[model samples]
Target: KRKVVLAEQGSFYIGGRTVTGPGKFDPSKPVIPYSNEGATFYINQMYVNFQAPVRPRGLPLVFWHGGGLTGHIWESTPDGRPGFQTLFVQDRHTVYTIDQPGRGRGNIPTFNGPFGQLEEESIVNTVTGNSSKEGAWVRDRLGPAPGQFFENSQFPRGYEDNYFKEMGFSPSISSDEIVDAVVKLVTHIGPCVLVTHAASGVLGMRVATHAKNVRGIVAYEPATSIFPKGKVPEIPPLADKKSQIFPPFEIQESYFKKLAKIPIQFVFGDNIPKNPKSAYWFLDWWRVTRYAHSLSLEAINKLGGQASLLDLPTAGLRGNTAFPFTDRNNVQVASLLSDFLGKHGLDQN
Candidate 1:
């Protein structure tokens, strides 16, 4: 049995506003200014859940959810199995799961861009490998789809509705805003290891630029291209198509230089290369992640910084999907992360 020393959860609104006006239906009626009520607030909000045991690791770990996801990123799998939060807590590591601004409890005043939900068929096909699409990978490891157990599936198919329920509209947020909120959080939490997935990976990189307290970064398939400002390399496309030149990032050398001192690791799932059907979806990610991390490591190494890319299959963990944290081999994957952090001295005991 585990003993809990302290566990608490709370939220802090970063920016907001208040408005007052008369009732719409009775605008002409006696203007009871005091009784009249109208309110509108536009601000970025962050929701956090912190937990720890009697004996905790020296440094805390922060988990940033991906786009279209909330703090549920660290929660139990939709199928009812324990997730990263439980595993890390059991390991005596203090954990902080954060819902990025404009998401989850951090509600917004309104959506700025076009909003839409991931179609169920696309979700089932891409996530569960049950689609007839040409690029849909066959995911037998997750067990049979639909009626079968989501055994090794990274996502919980049996309880997909529950998973979908947690998803919401992803409002477009600028890098500056993300960095501001993240930097504030890091300042409040002190030095910590930032673990980011998917879209949050982009925000994590930007956050590292301004937050000195960020000791380390573990980005799980961050969806951005990080390379030298002027240099562009041509790479072959996923399908039988002409090679395309890598896209360039409009940035300065100082940005890369700032990351030199911070140790970083970018983890990629195995499905990218092995699954030809899904090659198109992951090919660019694989290319950019490898190249960007390589360049970043080279630049950082020159400045005495440390960074590396971890290909899951190459690391002996295979058949992982985009959401490796919730996959069938999540525990094993978590152990791998623990080792990585320990190697870099981020997983202090």
Candidate 2:
């Protein structure tokens, strides 16, 4: 017998709208009147799911999904396995999962503007490791064949169709918008640990920089690089014979000072390495991401901050997909995260 509590669940609009002049009505259509209404609603929607264990924990855990994804990332896996959201809840932590602005239940009308869409092949290949450089694909762990995914891939085999169906497109939002919306969310919810995946990694960094309420951050394969402004290193091709240069921190020293008090972790999955002929895209991403994180860590350490770069493979967790939260070893991965939170004092009882 177990008890759970639904702390809060609701939707909120963060921006505002403007009214426009009414236009001429068209009565040619039977029983239907057409009018050009110029009322402009420039608001973006955000939906949240806040749940806590009956026993309670220190602070809430906020899960922010990656590009072209929604709050569903925190839900059950495509194969029906319990996801990180459930695992964390079972561990007695308060959980808060959100659909980013202009996504899923957070959908905003295009009356504001147009957005971009991710092709099915792009999503499939990227997530399944099929698009990885020739030799980088772990054929045995990821696959139907060379170009196809591993038959035993951890992403819920046979549910590819359902995964595709649930995928959503992201709106063309500016960095300011992303930062603003997320910061507002943190303000509303109070202090919490932000767990970000893929593109949300950059968002998380910016949010941490801006939000004093953010306790810490756990970034999983963030898609962008954050350096001191204009200090990004010129990463050479993986095949380039020359060594890479990691630029020094260019962002404000004060920012590092603030960050030094926060706990930060950047996590990457296994099987990304330099295979002679194959240059895995993920491996490439990891190389740059690791450098970026190193820069951040350097800045933090200089200011007495604590940070770590976590490579799952080095930790003995092997063959994890890009979406490791839904991968075959999701439970184990969740346990590791739970442990991390506890170690950092974020998992208070």
Candidate 3:
């Protein structure tokens, strides 16, 4: 259903790292920070080139790939639909994709060598492997990484838990960790927009909330499923330890009250149905939009906030699945996002 062809190539910079279209990159020069341990990761992006009469109004767009996928999903490949890549290109919008930490090319570590080998004689705790691979090896030496708790996790599947847990980072590192890294790259590129899909929607919220420079956020399939009157599932304890309890969705009533100043649009795939039983499958079409409304109303009640929630009228076509599978619909959602921005004053300035 998507078209693919060779296009013009170019070079750009992201997070102090230079990215060249149509070229393979050295893993060491990855877009994200790598662990000195054995993990190695980076961002892989595909850009679409087209000649349009004029550019769309508003900021350059940043697309955050969902779990288990890379930036390449935005465009058509020889084998599949080019998620947002084709969609944005057709609309004359500049699209930028990010391979966020714990996902895509950003999930691997730079260091893959052994840290210290046990010995009987000298008992020297010596580091091994190429100095470059040491990053993945020395993860423990670095205080705490972002999403580290997921490492030993049983839920959320495989190494995702590990990747997030080992990152030892937090949503708080907004200044140097997020904004400083790619903000300039986007500004230099053009008008900036923030588009996040599914799981990354939460991360996008964190980034947008802290980054004062962010223009707005388009959260497609955000997992605000457990809000107000929605079903709340019991947490499956990780490794026999009781899972930490986060504040109830109502608790955020006050926070959303303040966030009303920022434009947060929540969308979902019409075809997707809410799973009444499964806790893991949070945020069905209705619930996602419902929470957005709840947050907006709560904000208005608390502080007269202006955030708005919009639900798409059409199905995403592709049924439910994880990142790479559902990426196409997410791309389609971007088209609507562009239109939404156009309607608002944001597209102008």
Best prediction by lDDT: 2
lDDT of 2 by residue, 6-94 (tens): 55444555432233334433455442242224333444556677777776787888899887678787887777777777788888787
lDDT score, candidate 1, position 322: 65
Candidate 3, superposed: residue stretches over 4 Å from native: 1-13, 16-56, 77-79, 105-107, 115-191, 224-258, 271-275, 278-293, 300-302, 313-335, 346-349
Clashing residue pairs, backbone N/CA/C < 3 A, model 1: 135-277, 142-153, 154-327
Q: Lowest-scoring 10 consecutive residues by lDDT in candidate 2?
A: 120-129
For model 3, how does the per-residue alpha-carbon lDDT over 71-188 read when each residue is reduced to its tens digit?
6545442234455655665555555666553234442222223322111211112432221213321221111122332222112223333323322221111223443444444445
Error of 1 at 207 (Å): 0.6
Cα error, candidate 2, residue 155 (Å): 3.2
Which of 2 and 3 is ahead in TM-score? 2
- Model 2 residue runs over 4 Å out of place are 1-38, 112-147, 150-153, 238-253, 274-283
Ranking by lDDT: 2, 1, 3
RMSD of 3: 13.0
